[PDB]
Amino acid sequence: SKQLIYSGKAKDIYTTEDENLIISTYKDQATAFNGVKKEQIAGKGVLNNQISSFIFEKLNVAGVATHFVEKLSDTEQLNKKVKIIPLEVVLRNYTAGSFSKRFGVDEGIALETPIVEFYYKNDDLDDPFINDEHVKFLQIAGDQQIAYLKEETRRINELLKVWFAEIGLKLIDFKLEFGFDKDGKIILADEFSPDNCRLWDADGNHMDKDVFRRGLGELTDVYEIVWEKLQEL
Amino acid sequence: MSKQLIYSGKAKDIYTTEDENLIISTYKDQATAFNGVKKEQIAGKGVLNNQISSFIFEKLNVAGVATHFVEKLSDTEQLNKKVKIIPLEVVLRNYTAGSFSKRFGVDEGIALETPIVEFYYKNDDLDDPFINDEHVKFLQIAGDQQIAYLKEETRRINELLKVWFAEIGLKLIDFKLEFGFDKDGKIILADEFSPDNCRLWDADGNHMDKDVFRRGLGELTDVYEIVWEKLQELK
Numbered sequence: 001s002k003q004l005i006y007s008g009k010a011k012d013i014y015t016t017e018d019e020n021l022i023i024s025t026y027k028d029q030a031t032a033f034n035g036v037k038k039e040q041i042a043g044k045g046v047l048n049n050q051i052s053s054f055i056f057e058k059l060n061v062a063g064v065a066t067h068f069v070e071k072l073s074d075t076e077q078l079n080k081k082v083k084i085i086p087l088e089v090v091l092r093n094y095t096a097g098s099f100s101k102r103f104g105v106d107e108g109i110a111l112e113t114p115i116v117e118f119y120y121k122n123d124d125l126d127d128p129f130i131n132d133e134h135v136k137f138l139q140i141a142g143d144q145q146i147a148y149l150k151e152e153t154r155r156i157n158e159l160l161k162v163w164f165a166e167i168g169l170k171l172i173d174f175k176l177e178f179g180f181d182k183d184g185k186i187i188l189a190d191e192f193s194p195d196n197c198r199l200w201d202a203d204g205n206h207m208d209k210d211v212f213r214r215g216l217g218e219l220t221d222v223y224e225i226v227w228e229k230l231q232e233l
Numbered sequence: 234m235s236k237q238l239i240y241s242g243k244a245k246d247i248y249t250t251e252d253e254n255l256i257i258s259t260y261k262d263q264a265t266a267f268n269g270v271k272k273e274q275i276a277g278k279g280v281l282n283n284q285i286s287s288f289i290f291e292k293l294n295v296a297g298v299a300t301h302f303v304e305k306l307s308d309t310e311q312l313n314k315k316v317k318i319i320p321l322e323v324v325l326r327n328y329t330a331g332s333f334s335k336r337f338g339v340d341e342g343i344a345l346e347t348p349i350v351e352f353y354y355k356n357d358d359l360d361d362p363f364i365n366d367e368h369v370k371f372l373q374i375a376g377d378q379q380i381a382y383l384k385e386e387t388r389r390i391n392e393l394l395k396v397w398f399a400e401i402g403l404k405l406i407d408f409k410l411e412f413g414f415d416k417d418g419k420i421i422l423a424d425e426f427s428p429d430n431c432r433l434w435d436a437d438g439n440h441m442d443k444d445v446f447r448r449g450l451g452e453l454t455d456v457y458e459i460v461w462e463k464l465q466e467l468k
């Protein structure tokens with residue numbers, strides 16, 4: 001029992017007795033594109049929290065610095081408390097969704113090398129897509145910081161892409177958040193579940209949140225499958 | 234004036250010459266809004282525009298900027314070097330206005346220091362979407378060293394334009410360049426620099442450009458003329 005700091009779409013965050021520490025609670029809320037249509041859909045909290053806890057651990061083993069300490073419940077994990085960088089970092093392996101729209105090209109077209117993209121994590125501004133100069137203007141980060149957020153998201157793509165391959169899923173794109181820890185460094189934060197990445201079945205089947213949005217089945221089913229496959233590592 | 238069409242634009246019909254390397258540009262009386270959505274014929278516009286562009290482009294040539302400009306042919310026409318256009322629209326911002334205002338949710342009118350440059354892919358089917366460096370490399374438009382060149386040039390270009398407009402009392406909020414390749418493969422400033430293509434605030438905050446058309450604040454040629462007049466007071 002401790003205090004609720006922030007209340008999200010997918011996560012409520014609580015405090016502890018350790019200033020630098022935070023317990024994350026994954027909710028059953030699901031919400032669609034920016035025009036937040038809201039459905040609450042059972043089991044989702046637990047799968048997300050499992051999957052995220054797993055990958056994050058795997059990353060930590062692979063020496064990626066992150067906010068993960070331990071999965072504490074079905075519903076909760078304990079995380080290092082960081083100061084969030086309002087900058088969603090998207091790395092794309094394949095064309096899909098908003099890249100596809102922006103460039104009027106289909107989804108499924110491979111890229112090589114992969115493209116990263118910043119978005120201003122500002123719900124009020126509808127999390128707009130931005131360029132490096134916009135980030136500097138916003139004073140989120142200068143140079144050296146921008147080049148770090150890239151250089152490590154790529155390293156993160158390289159680990160993750162391999163891992164999902166091995167379980168027969170192609171990492172189409174994902175989305176990080178990073179923040180500063182009590183010691184000032186930058187650190188992979190938030191969560192890595194099917195909610196913030198795209199996953200393609202070797203037959204084009206969507207093993208991700210595009211099931212809720214496009215509406216091609218029930219969510220917990222594909223998530224369940226991904227969770228099942230991950231323990232193959 | 235009699236040769237064949239190379240392509241029709243919303244503002245400019247560009248014709249051929251006997252000189253493979255040279256283009257004669259024809260400025261039209263047509264004005265088009267947002268995503269080509271609404272358009273009107275406004276008399277004098279092409280002429281008014283044609284002088285402004287020829288004048289600025291001349292001044293650039295004398296201040297050492299490579300451009301596609303050779304001479305003004307007449308009211309409606311000028312002669313230009315043929316370029317393989319770079320389908321990037323390059324926007325430099327000095328003050329906030331319009332789209333930057335939209336995306337970042339703040340007022341038209343705030344000084345930026347430094348000025349922000351922004352690429353859009355010149356592709357009307359896509360409504361010239363806003364793109365970032367890595368999209369340009371994707372799109373196969375330019376390599377790094379070149380994107381860096383487009384940047385550094387649009388900057389020293391602002392640092393001339395801003396002054397000249399200052400001296401006649403005009404606030405260069407933002408503009409929008411286009412560059413292309415000349416006969417010897419050198420990047421070169423081209424297209425046009427009219428008030429269709431930039432923002433020029435009055436000291437009273439009055440709109441000395443196409444925002445008069447967009448926001449329908451009144452008629453375009455009044456203002457365009459006032460700028461032509463003012464520009465003629467320079468050197």
Ligand SMILES: Nc1ncnc2c1ncn2[C@@H]1O[C@H](COP(=O)(O)OP(=O)(O)O)[C@@H](O)[C@H]1O
Pocket residue numbers: 006007008009010011012013022067079080081082083084177179189190191
């Ligand atoms: N280590 C951390 N310290 C502080 N805040 C965090 C940390 N990790 C994630 N967060 C934030 O917790 C919030 C969780 O709510 P969530 O529903 O994920 O947000 P969103 O609705 O933006 O997706 C997010 O705004 C995220 O930035």
Ligand SMILES: Nc1ncnc2c1ncn2[C@@H]1O[C@H](COP(=O)(O)OP(=O)(O)O)[C@@H](O)[C@H]1O
Pocket residue numbers: 240241242243244245246247256301313314315316317318411413423424425
């Ligand atoms: N020197 C040049 N050589 C060849 N094409 C040019 C040159 N300068 C401009 N252009 C192109 O000619 C067209 C001019 O039509 P315009 O109405 O200005 O285009 P838009 O409707 O895209 O604004 C544009 O596609 C522009 O890029």
Ligand SMILES: [Cl-]
Pocket residue numbers: 129363
């Ligand atoms: Cl955009």
Ligand SMILES: [Mg+2]
Pocket residue numbers: 010190
């Ligand atoms: Mg989130």
Ligand SMILES: [Mg+2]
Pocket residue numbers: 242244424
């Ligand atoms: Mg044009």
